[PDB]
């Protein structure tokens, strides 16, 4: 039986998001990609570097906004701009969200030597697609 990225059926009490509810075979069919860049297009270079950077940014944001992220990150690259789009919760005070945006945008801009912007969308609670 296939296991990869499949939330398994339970008793009907486990809330899953839209992304978690779709196994890998639904990628490009029902769900899109969480990162968009040009490195994986035919004739394009630097796919290895974009991949490591994305793996880091996901870990960096998970630990920089602990308990605040309500869904996976959406990473967008246009030119040398790096845009991080995150769905966050409404538990932390807004002052702490502004501190962490200012802190994270500056730290990541100096780390990867590119203009980095972080866009936060707040939700009162994790959006539930279905109960598995």
């Amino acid at each position: 039986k296939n296991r990869a990225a499949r939330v398994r059926v339970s008793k009907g009490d486990k809330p899953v998001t839209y992304e978690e509810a779709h196994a890998p075979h639904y990628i490009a069919h029902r769900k899109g990609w969480l990162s968009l860049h040009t490195g994986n297009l035919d004739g394009e270079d630097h796919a290895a570097e974009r991949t490591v950077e994305d793996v880091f940014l996901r870990k960096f944001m998970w630990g920089t906004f602990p308990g605040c992220l309500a869904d996976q990150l959406v990473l967008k690259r246009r030119g040398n701009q790096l845009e991080i789009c995150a769905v966050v919760l409404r538990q932390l005070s807004p002052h702490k969200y502004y501190f962490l945006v200012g802190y994270s945008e500056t730290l990541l801009s100096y780390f990867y030597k590119c203009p980095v912007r972080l866009h936060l969308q707040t939700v009162p609670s994790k959006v539930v697609y279905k109960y598995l």
């Binding site: 490591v52 793996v55 880091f56 870990k59 998970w62 602990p66 308990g67 932390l92 002052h95 702490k96 502004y98 501190f99 962490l100």
Partner: protein, 343 residues
């Protein structure tokens, strides 16, 4: 390596080992079990070992109307913070350690006799706060299955009652012991019997019946006698509201046969009014504490017969040798009439 690290969920799912051939069939037992702990619980965003004070994250942004600057706690001031967090961690663990103990049932490891609380409120704003639930039997039933071999289910027997004559029982079945409790106690409240009580403390007459192979003989008793009955009968009697009764169980001691046999016998007891209406005569109670005073307990609502009840010189009623042997002083038992706790 930073890139080889995983999230807390991944680490606990692995370390706990709740999914696996060990946990599928309970092939592994857990006298020592890894317990999940939330390590982000008492953690404050912005707090690190170095003790830096970040304005707007872990300390106030403005102080005295001016923006605070980056600062660091002194070595002494940081030791106190570390010590205070360690104490808070034992205090949190100590609070969890302080859990209210529940009373035991018929024995320390037995489920029988334990209260489950009132049945859950029904969908249509129905409530059963007046009803108490007691467990009578919790059994592990093992079903052999075509592909999965021996599987373990739970069969629970519970009784419910309000202490004012309305009581019932129901069986519950589920894979989990707590789902069986819910099914049994919720179903029982829809199968309530009404039990008539003499003076709201005892039964109306001696009841002797057999259900399958379980014999139950119950005796009407005066006030203060208490419940001298099989422990399960004691539990059910408190739910019905019977305070004084003697019962003796013979033959098979099957909890289910005993439970449904007891409700069958208590639901078919003829009251004094029914006897008076049936025979159109007065029912007169003679109490030795009241001497020869005749106390009419019930009178027929319809006409009153004029012909006395025939006085058969000798009744052809069947007697219990156990009752007769006791009245003649020929019953010798070291276990009879023993001193016991108030029931």
């Amino acid at each position: 390596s930073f890139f080889t690290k995983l999230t807390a969920d991944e680490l606990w799912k692995g370390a706990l080992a709740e999914t696996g051939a060990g946990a599928k069939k309970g092939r592994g037992k857990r006298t020592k079990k890894k317990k999940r702990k939330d390590l982000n619980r008492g953690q404050i965003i912005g707090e690190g070992r170095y003790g830096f004070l970040w304005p707007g994250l872990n300390v106030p942004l403005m102080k005295n109307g001016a923006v605070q600057t980056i600062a660091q706690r002194s070595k002494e001031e940081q030791e106190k913070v570390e010590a205070d967090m360690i104490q808070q961690r034992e205090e949190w663990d100590r609070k969890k350690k302080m859990k209210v103990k529940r009373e035991r049932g018929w024995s320390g490891n037995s489920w029988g006799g334990i209260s489950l609380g009132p049945p859950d409120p029904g969908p249509c704003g129905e409530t059963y706060e007046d009803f108490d639930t007691r467990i009578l039997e919790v059994r592990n039933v093992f079903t052999m299955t075509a592909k999965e071999g021996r599987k373990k289910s739970i069969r629970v027997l519970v009784a419910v009652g309000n202490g004012k004559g309305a009581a019932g029982f129901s069986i519950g079945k589920a894979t989990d012991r707590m789902d069986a409790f819910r099914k049994a106690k919720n179903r029982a409240v829809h199968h309530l019997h009404y039990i008539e009580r003499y003076e709201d403390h005892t039964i109306f007459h001696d009841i002797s019946l057999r259900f399958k192979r379980t014999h139950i003989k119950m005796k009407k008793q005066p006030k203060g006698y208490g419940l001298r009955c099989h422990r399960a009968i004691i539990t059910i009697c408190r739910l019905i509201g019977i305070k004084d009764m003697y019962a003796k169980v013979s033959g098979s001691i099957n909890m289910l046969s005993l439970t449904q046999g007891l409700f069958r016998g208590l639901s078919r007891q003829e009251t004094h009014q029914q006897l008076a209406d049936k025979k159109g005569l007065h029912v007169v109670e003679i109490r030795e504490e009241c001497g020869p005073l005749p106390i009419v307990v019930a009178s027929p609502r319809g006409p009153l017969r004029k012909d006395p009840e025939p006085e058969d010189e000798v009744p052809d009623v069947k007697l219990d040798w156990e009752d007769v042997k006791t009245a003649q002083g020929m019953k010798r038992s070291v276990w009879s009439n023993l001193k016991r706790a108030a029931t």
